[PDB]
Amino acid sequence: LFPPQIKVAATYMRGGTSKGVFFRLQDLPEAAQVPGPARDALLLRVIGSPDPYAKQIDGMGGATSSTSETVILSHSSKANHDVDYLFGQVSIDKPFVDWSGNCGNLTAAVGAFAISNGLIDAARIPRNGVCTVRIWQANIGKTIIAHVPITDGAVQETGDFELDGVTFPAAEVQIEFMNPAADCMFPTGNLVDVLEVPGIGRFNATMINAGIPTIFINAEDLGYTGTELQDDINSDNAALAKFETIRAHGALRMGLIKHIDEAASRQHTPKIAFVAPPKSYASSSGKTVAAEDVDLLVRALSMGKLHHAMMGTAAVAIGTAAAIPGTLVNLAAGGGEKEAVRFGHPSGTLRVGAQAVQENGEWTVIKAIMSRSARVLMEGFVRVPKP
Amino acid sequence: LFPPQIKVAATYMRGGTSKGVFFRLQDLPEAAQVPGPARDALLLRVIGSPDPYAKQIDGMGGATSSTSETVILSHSSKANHDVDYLFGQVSIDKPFVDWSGNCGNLTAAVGAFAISNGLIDAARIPRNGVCTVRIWQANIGKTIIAHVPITDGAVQETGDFELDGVTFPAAEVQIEFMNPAADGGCMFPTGNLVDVLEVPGIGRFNATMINAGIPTIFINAEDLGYTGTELQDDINSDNAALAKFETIRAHGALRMGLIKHIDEAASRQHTPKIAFVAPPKSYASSSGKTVAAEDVDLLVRALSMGKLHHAMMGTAAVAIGTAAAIPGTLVNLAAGGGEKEAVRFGHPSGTLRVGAQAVQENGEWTVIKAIMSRSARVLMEGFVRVPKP
């Protein structure tokens, strides 16, 4: 006989409320330097998947969607970009890596990794200040900007900026998702649709493609209040099944898939989320989120479970939808023109800015913005058995 | 002024059904090279604790007891030992690292780490074959042996040996826990093979309390209304059940003499362990595989740090094998009674075989050793980072 494990240079990082394994493209084994089965098999093995035990005890994964994540970065040859970014959502249970979406939380870590690993021109890095990293999000074909603080020519990781869902403070990293609307913001052409879901019921829904394709429904239409924590939903098999059926049909209605059964393998996109007007609740850390602290409540699912905080991509979808009068998100937030919203999720709150402009009946959004943070947890070499 | 993070050389490994962060003593910052608050603070931050979110998203931990684990290894000064092993169980919710126990699953990884990191006399490492690593378990003062395979002067990590609860095969590493009975000491601190554990207002529970591998309270599944086939989802979302187990564990700790006041159990979470046992019965494991009644001698489920464990703690496996070898314990009786040189028990992830050699001496039981096979592999090697202490 059994050959030794191979070593692959890698960095394990927290970005926002997620953890991922990061690779320079050139550090991957040659076979994995192009998309396909060899790359996917390698990433699966690094993470510890597929795992019928659902624990990822034999890999780098943490057995949750927000800890079963891989990133491949390279210097970009594209005009006006520094770094090319591929995000792979590694299935816990299936031998599958999903490449259909971005990861918003890891974006801050992408910027930092790029700087620390020479993927941006040295001339673009100030000695002290803020380095603006232009990221080509290669999964979805979008520009994202990470403003990473620099001290003495190196990434400033540590700091006093707090994120709800991140245990310890770190340096603030401002992110900007440019032109988030898919090249349509509303695939159905409607702000709100009646989603026909065979076997479940009829649901008013806003389906938006900004940040990530997302289906928003009202909490009350599912018997929820919007203050739910993970334990209220993630042990409820019937409830989880209801959510998945809706997501599948939404995917079809959005024209993301050609047929309903594609949703079985395509778990990662679209996302499904429920919204509610402000209401006070204790977050997962025990801290009180007061109704006055937020504009609305949003809970989202990822890979079949209620997410512990909020996906960064879904935060973009929330901010963008809130800015367009008449979406379910906008209405949950009290209606009107909104240039930003702070929403309550299970771990606390998150503020996203998105200014929309109307001209000739159409709504456009130049960018959605939010702050995150990132830090290296471990750097060196991951090992897997010889492929 | 927010200084850069410090870097500490470390290796992240799977050992058995657990993951932990491993350090050579000499690689630690000076202040952390002795037991104390500086060491504990470093390890807490590496793992991502204390974490009110209970997710450990800001460290190396995986938000379960079997993935919130640290190990410090050093050259031994003990006669006939190669390496000293300290295990730190890192609390998820409190700023606390518990040093009162061993970790059995990580023992195979300890052997491998020691060989790979210059802690073993080169004369004892063959170019090819088996390196017998003599480990001084410094938490509990016991000898443990790891037979680590060697190829081309390096640890042979990969192989075809499978463990239930470990996703992928690897090289078999046989482990031997020498003289596992404690010197709340003695093999049976109450002096009885079975006791009646009185928990006023909660129940009366027949129990075997044994100190071998780790102090452990065994009760019969049926006395709790369980069958022994339970999986994590049957217990870990049941706050009533978890509270009941904790009260029983506290009363067992008091009865064993491990604590003097019942309230001490709140801070002393790591030891003793509590487990429940039953005769063989068929069930689907957490992976979906059927464990047939014929495949096992008994069923055992254990809790660790207030949750049903996903597989079995290696220390508790030693307690199971040892108790099973002593005729009349609840474990022995669940396995059909009589002398028993080994048992295969069913846990939530499948089965585990443990052998324990019990021999009479002066009309009293002695247990020479307990043995089992595990495996280990490096997951990531390099440097962990934390903000400057």
Burial string for B362-386 (b: 16+ CB within 10 Å, else e) reads: eeebebebbbbbbbbbbbbbbebbb
Report the run of H or E that residue A264 belongs to, with start and end.
Answer: helix A262-265
Say how far apart CA A320 and CA A368 lie, in whole Å: 7
| Length in residues, chain A | 387
Q: Which residue of B has its CA nearest to A380?
A: B382
Other Cβ atoms within 10 Å of A264 Cβ, number: 10
Report the run of H or E that residue B368 belongs to, with start and end.
Answer: strand B364-374
- Alpha helix ranges (H) inside chain B: 37-47, 107-116, 232-235, 239-256, 314-324, 330-334
Nearest CA among B195, B198, B202, B200 for reference residue B224: B202
Residue of A5, A378, A383 to mutate, testing the B interface (most B Cβ within 10 Å of its Cβ)? A378
Say how far apart CA A256 and CA A141 lie, in whole Å: 16
Say how far apart CA B194 and CA B252 lie, in whole Å: 12
CB under 8 Å to A146, separation ≥6 — which residues?
Answer: A107, A108, A110, A111, A112, A132, A133, A135, A173, A174, A175
- Residue ranges and CATH numbers for the domains of chain B are 1-179+371-389 (3.10.310.10), 180-370 (3.10.310.10)
CA angle A114, A116, A122 (to 5 degrees): 80
First to last CA, chain B: 13
Residue of B17, B18, B49, B58 to mutate, testing the A interface (most A Cβ within 10 Å of its Cβ)? B58
Interface touch B58/A347, C-beta < 8 Å = no
For A48, the closest of B58, B165, B167 (CB atoms) is B167
For B237, the closest of A56, A158, A231 (CB atoms) is A231
Q: How was this structure determined?
A: X-ray
Burial string for B294-308 (b: 16+ CB within 10 Å, else e) reads: eebbbbbbbbbbbeb
Q: How far is A143 from chain B (nearest CA, A)?
A: 27
Looking at beta carbons, which residues of chain A come within 8 Å of B156? 2, 4
DSSP assignments along A213-263, one per residue: EEEEEEGGGGT--S---GGGTTT-HHHHHHHHHHHHHHHHHTTSSSSTTHH
Say how far apart CA A310 and CA A211 lie, in whole Å: 13
Looking at beta carbons, which residues of chain B come within 8 Å of A166? 57-58
Q: How far is B186 from chain A (nearest CA, A)?
A: 34
Query: Contact B82/B76 with Cβ under 8 angstroms?
Result: yes
Interface touch A53/B384, C-beta < 8 Å = no
Interface touch A167/B59, C-beta < 8 Å = yes
Nearest CA among B348, B104, B48 for reference residue A165: B48
Query: Contact B315/B215 with Cβ under 8 angstroms?
Result: no
CB under 8 Å to B210, separation ≥6 — which residues?
Answer: B187, B188, B216, B218, B319, B322, B323, B329
Resolution (A): 1.2
Say how far apart CA A325 and CA B145 lie, in whole Å: 69
Q: How far is B62 from chain A (nearest CA, A)?
A: 5
Coil, strand or helix at B223: helix
Question: CB-based burial of residue B240 (10 Å sphere; 0-12 exposed, 13-18 middle, 19+ buried)?
Answer: exposed
First to last CA, chain A: 14
User: Considering all CA atoms of chain B, what is the largest pairwise distance in Å, rounded to the nearest integer?
Assistant: 69
Say how far apart CA A120 and CA A299 lie, in whole Å: 36
Pairing mode, strands B273-278 and B283-284: unpaired
Q: Phi and psi (nearest 5°) for A306?
A: -60, 125
CA distances from B81 to A7, A208, B154 (A): 31, 64, 20
For A284, the closest of B53, B168, B385 (CB atoms) is B53
Interface touch A4/B59, C-beta < 8 Å = no
Say how far apart CA B133 and CA B145 lie, in whole Å: 6
Contacts A–B by Cβ distance under 8 A: 158
Q: Annotated catalytic sites of B, by residue?
A: 103, 313
Q: Which residue of B has its CA nearest to A163?
A: B58
Q: Phi and psi (nearest 5°) for B348?
A: -60, -25
Interface touch A383/B380, C-beta < 8 Å = yes
Looking at beta carbons, which residues of chain A come within 8 Å of B128? none
Q: Which residue of B has its CA nearest to A373?
A: B58
For A383, the closest of B17, B53, B379 (CB atoms) is B379
Looking at beta carbons, which residues of chain B come within 8 Å of A57? 14, 17-19, 66-67, 165-167
Other Cβ atoms within 10 Å of B332 Cβ, number: 25
Q: How far is A380 from chain B (nearest CA, A)?
A: 4
How many CA atoms lie less than 13 Å away from B71 in the CB half-sphere? 34
Structure-token match 């007891």, residue found = B65
For A167, the closest of B51, B380, B382 (CB atoms) is B51
Interface touch A60/B380, C-beta < 8 Å = yes
Structure-token match 């307990």, residue found = B370
Phi-psi region of B48 (alpha: psi -120 to 50; beta: other; left: phi over 0): left
Q: How far is A19 from chain B (nearest CA, A)?
A: 6
For A57, the closest of B10, B18, B52 (CB atoms) is B18
Q: Which residue of A has its CA nearest to B288?
A: A52
| Token pair belonging to B169 | 């095969």
Residue of B51, B167, B388 to mutate, testing the A interface (most A Cβ within 10 Å of its Cβ)? B167
Interface touch A4/B165, C-beta < 8 Å = no
Q: How far is A370 from chain B (nearest CA, A)?
A: 19
Interface touch A57/B160, C-beta < 8 Å = no
CA distances from A78 to A85, A187, B318 (A): 12, 28, 59
Q: Which residue of A has its CA nearest to B236?
A: A235
Q: Which residue of A has its CA nearest to B233?
A: A235
Looking at beta carbons, which residues of chain A come within 8 Å of B388? 158
CB under 8 Å to A193, separation ≥6 — which residues?
Answer: A204, A205, A206, A207, A253
Per the DSSP assignment, residues forming a β-bridge with A282 are A288
For A3, the closest of B158, B288, B380 (CB atoms) is B158
Query: Contact A318/A297 with Cβ under 8 angstroms?
Result: no
Structure-token match 């990531």, residue found = B380
How many CA atoms lie less than 13 Å away from A339 in the CB half-sphere? 0
Report the run of H or E that residue A134 belongs to, with start and end.
Answer: strand A129-137
Per the DSSP assignment, residues forming a β-bridge with A13 are A20, A376
User: Considering all CA atoms of chain A, what is the largest pairwise distance in Å, rounded to the nearest integer?
Assistant: 70
Q: Which residue of A has its CA nearest to B66?
A: A57
Query: Contact B326/B338 with Cβ under 8 angstroms?
Result: no
Residue of A8, A17, A58 to mutate, testing the B interface (most B Cβ within 10 Å of its Cβ)? A58
| Token pair belonging to B103 | 């970790």
For A4, the closest of B12, B158, B160 (CB atoms) is B158
Looking at beta carbons, which residues of chain A come within 8 Å of B64? 55
Q: Annotated catalytic sites of A, by residue?
A: 103, 311
Q: Which residue of A has its CA nearest to B47?
A: A377
Query: Contact B103/B315 with Cβ under 8 angstroms?
Result: yes
Nearest CA among B7, B385, B3, B8 for reference residue A156: B3
Interface touch B58/A286, C-beta < 8 Å = no
Interface touch A381/B381, C-beta < 8 Å = yes
CA distances from A172 to B23, B27, B243 (A): 31, 31, 40
| Token pair belonging to B35 | 């037991």
Q: What is the DSSP letter of A54?
A: S
| Token pair belonging to B386 | 């934390």
Nearest CA among B144, B132, B11, B116 for reference residue B72: B11
Looking at beta carbons, which residues of chain B come within 8 Å of A112? none
Structure-token match 């069913």, residue found = B346
